[PDB]
Amino acid sequence: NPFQFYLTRVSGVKPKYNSGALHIKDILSPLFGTLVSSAQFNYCFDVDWLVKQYPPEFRKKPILLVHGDKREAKAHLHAQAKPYENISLCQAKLDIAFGTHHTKMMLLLYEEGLRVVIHTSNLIHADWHQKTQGIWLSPLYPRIADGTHKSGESPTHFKADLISYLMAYNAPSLKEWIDVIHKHDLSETNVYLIGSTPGRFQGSQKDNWGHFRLKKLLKDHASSMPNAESWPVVGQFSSVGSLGADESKWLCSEFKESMLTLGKESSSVPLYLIYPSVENVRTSLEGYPAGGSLPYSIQTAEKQNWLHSYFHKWSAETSGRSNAMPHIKTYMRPSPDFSKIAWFLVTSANLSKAAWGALEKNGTQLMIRSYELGVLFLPSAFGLDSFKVKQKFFAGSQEPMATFPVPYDLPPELYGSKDRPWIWNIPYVKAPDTHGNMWVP
Ligand SMILES: O=P(O)(O)c1ccc(Nc2c(-c3ccccc3)nc3ccccn23)cc1
Numbered sequence: 001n002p003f004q005f006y007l008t009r010v011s012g013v014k015p016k017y018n019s020g021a022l023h024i025k026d027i028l029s030p031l032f033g034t035l036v037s038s039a040q041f042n043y044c045f046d047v048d049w050l051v052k053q054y055p056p057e058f059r060k061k062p063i064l065l066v067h068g069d070k071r072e073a074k075a076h077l078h079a080q081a082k083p084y085e086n087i088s089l090c091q092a093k094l095d096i097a098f099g100t101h102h103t104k105m106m107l108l109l110y111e112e113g114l115r116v117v118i119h120t121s122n123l124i125h126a127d128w129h130q131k132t133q134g135i136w137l138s139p140l141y142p143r144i145a146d147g148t149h150k151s152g153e154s155p156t157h158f159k160a161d162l163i164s165y166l167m168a169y170n171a172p173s174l175k176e177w178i179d180v181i182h183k184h185d186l187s188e189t190n191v192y193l194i195g196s197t198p199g200r201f202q203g204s205q206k207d208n209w210g211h212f213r214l215k216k217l218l219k220d221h222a223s224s225m226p227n228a229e230s231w232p233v234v235g236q237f238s239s240v241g242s243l244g245a246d247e248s249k250w251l252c253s254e255f256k257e258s259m260l261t262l263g264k265e266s267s268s269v270p271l272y273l274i275y276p277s278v279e280n281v282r283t284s285l286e287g288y289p290a291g292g293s294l295p296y297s298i299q300t301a302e303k304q305n306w307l308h309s310y311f312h313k314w315s316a317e318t319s320g321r322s323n324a325m326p327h328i329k330t331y332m333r334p335s336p337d338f339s340k341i342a343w344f345l346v347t348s349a350n351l352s353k354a355a356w357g358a359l360e361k362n363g364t365q366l367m368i369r370s371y372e373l374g375v376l377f378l379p380s381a382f383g384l385d386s387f388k389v390k391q392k393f394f395a396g397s398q399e400p401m402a403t404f405p406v407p408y409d410l411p412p413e414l415y416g417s418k419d420r421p422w423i424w425n426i427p428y429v430k431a432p433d434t435h436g437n438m439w440v441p
Contacts, residue, residue, distance in 0.1 A: 017320030033110030068101025099369035168197035196372035210357030236274035241352025287433025312412035319393035338410035347374020
């Protein structure tokens, strides 16, 4: 397949639903390359667990942890890392309040080349155990020969765009990785990078990041079709920020407007949001503890009850993962009958202004609080007008280079009248979960 989009392994499901899924130990195995060094961009790290995921023969190779922790949290991460002299740390600057470093990415330097992994899992055991998570695996990028002058650039501009993303950190450890990337040929890359970095972007930088980056790519590299107003937008996420007192403040104004863009010419578009209900969490493989990875607070939720009328249950029979709670985030543009999609994005970005950006200064400036990263699959980058949707995620299609593996069921199913969104800081004591327990925060 050309897409190289994988789910993580889920413990406990039938083997047929893990055939072609990847565990972290698979990604780091010597079969993927002879490791020289690596960078692990993430939010949360269990360092002892992380080192054990590397092959024994690679556990002393240099590792850079790129994180956003401050104050006592930074001290704790440093203390986790101090027993391993091969581990260095980069604290990503977060100079706007309430910002986070959420990007999940591995840079893997090998004797044979370079690989980039952009994915959705924290580097802790629980995120790779029984959750639905997404992975994009780059090709093995070969080194450009000493003395050869070539760009190594792809038609999607991925190499320069990944360097631009890393440049935003202004970090010496990441300039070293920028120089590694310069020395490699990334021209086979068929996805577009969509990043968020903290800042206030105007003018020539407005389109670099967040939802304006998405808009710009959709304007330049997608085509509008007849009855485009009938093609829904689907967003699927594991956390919800404060979106405002009604849908016009952000969600259905600037955010939906960027996501419905197609092509360069100048809304009734249905918007489906997929987010686990309480019942989804209760009956999940993990039970109520899965809700510790579904941060949606009651203080935020009670200020935006209008939002929950957009909410659809998690369902993933197609991948055997209805009970594997989602920590993947995805956004896509299906056709009215959900048989095709115009594009697909897998990203770290949840449904929040901090992640996607909020317009300021009379619509002239996009303000972003966090670091995020995802990859966009556009049909034009594969020589296609649209992607067919794969009927069964792990099955064998007649045209695998069309046929995009959407990991959950379409159409999404609206919450029922008795469903409620998972809210992680109130108790649930009416019905026990799959392990016999209640939820008492
Ligand atoms: O639907 P199928 O293809 O007929 C089918 C496939 C597998 C099984 N049994 C089964 C399971 C399992 C069964 C239920 C739920 C979770 C895991 N795990 C293993 C591992 C090795 C061998 C068998 N295993 C039964 C029927």
